[PDB]
Enzyme design. Structure first.
Site, PDB file in Angstrom:
ATOM      1  N   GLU A  24      47.260  36.926  32.511  1.00 48.87           N
ATOM      2  CA  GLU A  24      47.280  38.372  32.711  1.00 48.87           C
ATOM      3  C   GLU A  24      46.679  38.709  34.070  1.00 48.87           C
ATOM      4  OE1 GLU A  24      45.081  40.456  29.762  1.00 48.87           O
ATOM      5  OE2 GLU A  24      45.627  42.456  30.471  1.00 48.87           O
ATOM      6  N   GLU A  56      46.970  41.093  42.840  1.00 53.18           N
ATOM      7  CA  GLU A  56      45.767  40.330  42.531  1.00 53.18           C
ATOM      8  C   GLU A  56      45.926  38.847  42.819  1.00 53.18           C
ATOM      9  OE1 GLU A  56      44.613  41.160  38.543  1.00 53.18           O
ATOM     10  OE2 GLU A  56      44.323  43.310  38.930  1.00 53.18           O
TER      11      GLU A  56
HETATM   12  C1  MTA Z   1      42.319  40.095  32.546  1.00 51.67           C
HETATM   13  S1  MTA Z   1      42.035  40.272  34.331  1.00 51.67           S
HETATM   14  C2  MTA Z   1      42.279  38.664  35.134  1.00 51.67           C
HETATM   15  C3  MTA Z   1      41.316  37.635  34.509  1.00 51.67           C
HETATM   16  O1  MTA Z   1      41.620  36.329  35.001  1.00 51.67           O
HETATM   17  C4  MTA Z   1      40.473  35.808  35.682  1.00 51.67           C
HETATM   18  N1  MTA Z   1      40.901  35.010  36.796  1.00 51.67           N
HETATM   19  C5  MTA Z   1      41.500  35.461  37.941  1.00 51.67           C
HETATM   20  N2  MTA Z   1      41.735  34.453  38.722  1.00 51.67           N
HETATM   21  C6  MTA Z   1      41.332  33.353  38.173  1.00 51.67           C
HETATM   22  C7  MTA Z   1      41.352  32.028  38.585  1.00 51.67           C
HETATM   23  N3  MTA Z   1      41.900  31.671  39.844  1.00 51.67           N
HETATM   24  N4  MTA Z   1      40.849  31.083  37.783  1.00 51.67           N
HETATM   25  C8  MTA Z   1      40.327  31.406  36.589  1.00 51.67           C
HETATM   26  N5  MTA Z   1      40.295  32.681  36.167  1.00 51.67           N
HETATM   27  C9  MTA Z   1      40.789  33.655  36.938  1.00 51.67           C
HETATM   28  C10 MTA Z   1      39.754  36.784  36.117  1.00 51.67           C
HETATM   29  O2  MTA Z   1      38.328  36.375  36.271  1.00 51.67           O
HETATM   30  C11 MTA Z   1      39.878  37.907  35.019  1.00 51.67           C
HETATM   31  O3  MTA Z   1      38.986  37.727  34.055  1.00 51.67           O
HETATM   32  C1  84W Z   2      41.540  50.303  39.345  1.00 52.41           C
HETATM   33  N1  84W Z   2      42.310  49.243  38.722  1.00 52.41           N
HETATM   34  C2  84W Z   2      42.447  49.031  37.416  1.00 52.41           C
HETATM   35  C3  84W Z   2      43.253  47.939  37.249  1.00 52.41           C
HETATM   36  C4  84W Z   2      43.687  47.319  35.921  1.00 52.41           C
HETATM   37  C5  84W Z   2      43.876  48.100  34.791  1.00 52.41           C
HETATM   38  C6  84W Z   2      44.273  47.511  33.599  1.00 52.41           C
HETATM   39  C7  84W Z   2      44.493  46.096  33.533  1.00 52.41           C
HETATM   40  C8  84W Z   2      44.896  45.486  32.326  1.00 52.41           C
HETATM   41  O1  84W Z   2      45.086  46.262  31.179  1.00 52.41           O
HETATM   42  N2  84W Z   2      45.098  44.160  32.280  1.00 52.41           N
HETATM   43  N3  84W Z   2      44.908  43.374  33.429  1.00 52.41           N
HETATM   44  C9  84W Z   2      44.521  43.954  34.574  1.00 52.41           C
HETATM   45  C10 84W Z   2      44.314  43.112  35.828  1.00 52.41           C
HETATM   46  N4  84W Z   2      45.134  41.919  35.738  1.00 52.41           N
HETATM   47  C11 84W Z   2      44.312  45.346  34.627  1.00 52.41           C
HETATM   48  C12 84W Z   2      43.899  45.957  35.853  1.00 52.41           C
HETATM   49  C13 84W Z   2      43.605  47.482  38.490  1.00 52.41           C
HETATM   50  N5  84W Z   2      43.036  48.272  39.396  1.00 52.41           N
END
Ligand code: MTA
Ligand code: 84W
Lengths: 297, 625
Positions: free
Chosen positions: B423, B432
């Site tokens: 995710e 991201e």
């Molecule tokens: C649910 S938001 C994305 C989640 O994945 C995690 N995450 C993002 N990138 C990485 C990565 N390169 N390795 C392990 N976890 C990650 C982030 O710390 C966050 O908790």
């Molecule tokens: C200000 N801002 C908020 C987000 C956001 C919101 C909701 C989710 C979510 O519901 N799942 N995952 C992710 C990131 N991967 C996320 C990120 C990104 N920028």
């Protein structure tokens, strides 16, 4: 019957026998209202105590005019056209009707030839024809695109009247026509006055102080500011009285040449009315609370 | 609960008037601070020496009342753009006088009219007043939907009204406002008081005001219809506009006198309340983000930063999102393990970025409803969230889940996975760095392994919103490029804005990326057909992603996953607004750039006119690897 009367004098009109009608507005201070006054002795005005009759209105008096010999038609700040009438004794001024038909300040009002209908102009850009007997609006016209500055009924044609507006239009009206309005060919017009002895002739002043003689063109730079009003005298060959925001009064002849000039007023000159008794006497009122009696040569 | 006000041009006494207004139900009152007919001279004698007082005393109301109940109105005789010089000079002095008195009273807003085309001098005087002490007082420009000249009765015999369509002509009033606020350099204190006429213009004329800072809507009593019972109402077209305005939470202003004299005057107001009560209320998602409208947020960077506790909590408060993940895993387990092998084939699932474990539980619920066996790995580099995972694993999950506190790009997997679930997507899909993360984790995915999501795509759409443009503009900071705020995206719940074209796909990524020459850089050109006159302020961003086969997640408006709270749209602003005529094409260019350290976007507009390349070399915005 109120003791004090508002500072800003707005209108002054003589009737047949010579009694003077006064319309005043309180344009500053705590209360913003207006009043109506009748001075069977014109030299006693504006002294409130030496008056024949008087009454207070809910809002200011932007304009008024006689309706016969005992009727007073008022253009109120409240957006309402009011008709007041003197009693048989002419000691009380009583409200006849007060209809709120305009959506903004009612700026101008004029009684038509028959004396049974009137036309009013307002800042809501509307012009309305009134049935004074039925106390209802017969017609509502939205011909202009800005504030209606002045409406003047024809002296002898009961369906004809002029109107000017800040949209730079001078409109000749004839409600006998399907499209009743007609545009007459500058600076914004601000005042209208039909000629009393010539049907298709009228004069109009503009915001720049110029007075113009128009037929259905001759003009002269009379004032240094907005021309507020234009009143013809009752003489056979009438004179033209012009008052302005430059605090001066001017009297012009047939060719708009200046014959008299008065600077007795210290504020805006708001109206002028000729005496029916002495045709050479001209009365003016202004926001300086002065009622000046001019002897025009 | 509509916030409404009464507009008057006649106040004989303030205390009495204000009471009658409040008893009728209004919240505030628009009135002149000087008498509307009290013309004043400032230069020529003797009229300049008029003895005072010049207006009412401020002692007639309490400071709290002036601060909250009164809206000042500019005297109608004041014409700063008159062609007569003497009138301009007097209007200038009079305008300053009245405005200064409004500031003296601490009024919350002041009403000025836009009733003609040239308000240049009017704007200068106002701008001068604005730069005379810093204050929060608002200035509402009274501007009509339809110019009075364009709605006059066709009753002038020798000057008939136009009967042919003038597309741009019927939008003239918006040009009045646009030019005025442009002259005033987009001052945040200058807003619109849109005045509604008896006859509404074409939809394109009304839509012109989309994205404009409309604070008040003025309703003359003369536009109100009368129903059977003598009550005042509105036509179905006017009701349509009122509903649109309620979505903007504007303040409604009732002007004119009472024409339904049979009924009292709170009737007009009671009808507005009636319309407000009649509408679909906050439907979950609208109740979710009602206080986040047009609120700029920095886009999260979960890779570079460790997300806080309550940030994961927001992620988890969206059951529809994870039930879609559960379904996607469910379908994948069935396709990979035939029924005859449901007891011998254990599938190796790996949650890449497990956060606090919502995907872990979703995977567990999926294996159960699919009646298959799974071995779970929960990978998460945020050590603070790993605290939540390991308490979960000890108290509930047990040996079935293996928590791995590591970066998925460095982790040396003990085995290979049948399914990787992630995710890592932002509002703009890849903003991201989900591609780079999944690329590095790709080595420990089986040759026939499945990635969930399997692909995602970012969408862009040109938008007009002078409101959002101003908010971005207000994001200047002390020790950086004064224009860096325009060269970075913002996550925002776009509200007061106008979408100028249909969203089109921008960037796409697929996982696994079997390709031998992986390059996540991108360069995309888009052409947006615009069928209106407008002003371009930026591009909205959305994304679509395929979890598995037909199970999808989307914040794209036309394919928005119904009921999903997560992810607001992203906003790419542009330094300078761009005028766009009806029929013109908006050509925008987007780059996804990267080095070994950072990834970033660069965008540019090439048609109808060229903008400067935004965020070159990531000088203003970068996403940390
Ligand atoms: C649910 S938001 C994305 C989640 O994945 C995690 N995450 C993002 N990138 C990485 C990565 N390169 N390795 C392990 N976890 C990650 C982030 O710390 C966050 O908790
Ligand atoms: C200000 N801002 C908020 C987000 C956001 C919101 C909701 C989710 C979510 O519901 N799942 N995952 C992710 C990131 N991967 C996320 C990120 C990104 N920028």
């Amino acid at each position: 019957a109120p003791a004090c009367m508002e500072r800003q004098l707005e209108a002054a009109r003589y009737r047949s026998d010579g009694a003077l009608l006064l319309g005043a507005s309180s344009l500053s201070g705590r209360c913003w209202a207006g009043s109506l006054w009748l001075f069977k002795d014109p030299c006693a005005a504006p002294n409130e105590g030496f008056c024949s009759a008087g009454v207070q209105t809910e809002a200011g008096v932007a304009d008024l005019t006689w309706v016969g010999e005992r009727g007073i038609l008022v253009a109120s700040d409240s957006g309402a056209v009011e008709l007041w009438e003197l009693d048989e004794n002419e000691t009380l001024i009583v409200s006849k009707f007060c209809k709120y038909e305009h959506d903004d300040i009612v700026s101008t009002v004029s009684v038509l030839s028959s004396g049974t209908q009137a036309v009013s102009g307002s800042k809501d850009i509307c012009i309305k024809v009134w049935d004074l007997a039925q106390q209802v609006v017969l017609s509502s016209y939205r011909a202009h695109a800005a504030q209606v500055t002045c409406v003047a009924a024809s002296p002898h044609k009961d369906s004809v009247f002029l109107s000017c507006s800040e949209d730079n239009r001078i409109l000749l009206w004839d409600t006998r026509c399907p499209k009743p309005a007609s545009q007459i060919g500058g600076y914004l017009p601000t005042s209208l006055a039909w000629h009393p002895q010539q049907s298709e002739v009228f004069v109009f002043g503009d915001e720049n102080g110029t007075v113009s003689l128009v037929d259905t063109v001759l003009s002269s730079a009379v004032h240094s500011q907005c021309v507020t009003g234009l009143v013809f005298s009752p003489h056979s060959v009438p004179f033209l009285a012009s008052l302005s925001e430059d605090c001066s009064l001017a009297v012009l002849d047939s060719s708009l040449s200046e014959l008299f000039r008065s600077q007795a007023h210290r504020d805006f000159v708001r109206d002028a009315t000729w005496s029916p008794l002495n045709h050479s006497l001209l009365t003016t009122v202004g926001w300086d609370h002065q009622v000046v009696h001019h002897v025009v040569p | 609960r509509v916030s409404s006000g009464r507009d008057l041009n006649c106040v004989p006494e303030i205390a009495d008037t204000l009471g009658a207004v409040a008893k009728q139900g209004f919240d505030f009152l628009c009135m002149p601070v000087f008498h509307p007919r009290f013309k004043r001279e400032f230069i020529q004698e003797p009229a300049k020496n008029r003895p005072g007082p010049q207006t009412r005393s401020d002692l007639l109301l309490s400071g709290r009342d002036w601060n909250t109940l009164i809206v000042g109105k500019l005297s109608p005789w004041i014409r700063p753009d008159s062609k007569v010089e003497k009138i301009r000079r007097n209007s200038e002095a009079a305008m300053l006088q009245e405005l200064n008195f409004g500031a003296y009273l601490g009024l919350p807003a002041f009403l000025l009219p836009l009733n003609q085309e040239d308000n240049t001098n009017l704007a200068r005087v106002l701008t001068n007043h604005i730069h005379t002490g810093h204050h929060s007082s608002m200035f509402w420009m009274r501007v009509p939907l339809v110019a009075p000249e364009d709605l006059r009765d066709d009753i002038i015999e020798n000057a008939p009204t136009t009967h042919t369509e003038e597309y741009s002509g019927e939008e003239k009033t918006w040009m009045w406002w646009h030019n005025f606020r442009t002259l005033c350099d987009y001052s945040k204190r200058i807003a619109v008081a849109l005045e509604i006429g008896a006859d509404l213009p074409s939809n394109h004329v009304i839509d012109r005001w989309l994205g404009e800072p409309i604070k008040a809507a003025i309703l003359p009593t003369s536009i109100f219809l009368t129903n059977k019972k003598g009550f005042p109402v509105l036509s179905k077209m006017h009701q349509r506009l009122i509903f649109r305005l309620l979505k903007l939470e504007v303040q409604f202003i009732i002007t004119g006198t009472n024409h339904h004299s049979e009924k009292e005057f709170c009737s007009y107001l009671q009808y507005l309340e009636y319309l407000s009560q009649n509408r679909p209320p906050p439907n979950a998602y609208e109740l979710f983000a009602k206080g986040y409208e047009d609120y700029l947020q920095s886009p999260l960077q979960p890779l570079m930063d460790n997300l806080e506790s309550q940030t994961y909590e927001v992620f988890e408060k969206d059951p529809i999102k994870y039930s879609q993940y559960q379904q996607a895993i469910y379908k994948c387990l069935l396709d990979r393990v035939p029924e005859e092998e449901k007891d011998t084939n254990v599938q190796v699932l790996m949650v890449l970025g497990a956060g606090r474990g919502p995907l872990v539980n979703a995977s567990l619920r999926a294996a159960k409803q699919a009646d298959r066996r799974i071995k779970l790995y929960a990978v998460e580099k945020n050590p603070n969230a790993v605290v939540t995972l390991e308490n979960w694993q000890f108290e509930e999950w047990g040996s079935q889940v293996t928590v791995v506190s590591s970066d998925m790009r460095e982790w040396v997997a003990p085995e290979k996975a049948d399914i990787i679930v992630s995710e890592l997507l932002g509002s703009f899909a890849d903003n991201e760095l989900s591609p780079e993360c999944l690329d590095g984790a790709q080595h420990f995915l089986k040759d026939d392994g499945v990635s969930i999501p399997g692909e995602y795509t970012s969408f862009l759409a040109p938008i007009s919103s002078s409101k959002l443009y101003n908010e971005v503009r207000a994001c200047r900071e002390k020790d950086r490029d004064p224009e860096a705020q325009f060269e970075m995206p913002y996550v925002v719940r776009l509200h007061n804005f106008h979408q100028l074209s249909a969203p089109q796909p921008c960037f796409t990524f697929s996982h696994p990326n079997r390709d031998p020459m992986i390059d996540n850089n991108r360069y995309c050109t888009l052409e947006f057909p615009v069928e209106v006159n407008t002003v371009l302020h930026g591009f909205a961003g959305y994304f679509e992603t395929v979890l598995y086969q037909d199970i999808t997640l989307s914040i794209r408006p036309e394919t928005h996953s119904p009921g999903m709270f997560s992810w607001f749209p992203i906003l790419f602003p542009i330094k300078q607004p761009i005028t766009v005529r009806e029929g013109q094409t908006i050509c925008v260019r987007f780059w996804r750039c990267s080095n070994s350290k950072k990834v970033w976007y660069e965008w540019a507009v090439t048609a109808p006119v060229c903008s400067a390349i935004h965020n070159p070399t990531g000088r203003s915005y970068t996403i940390g690897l």
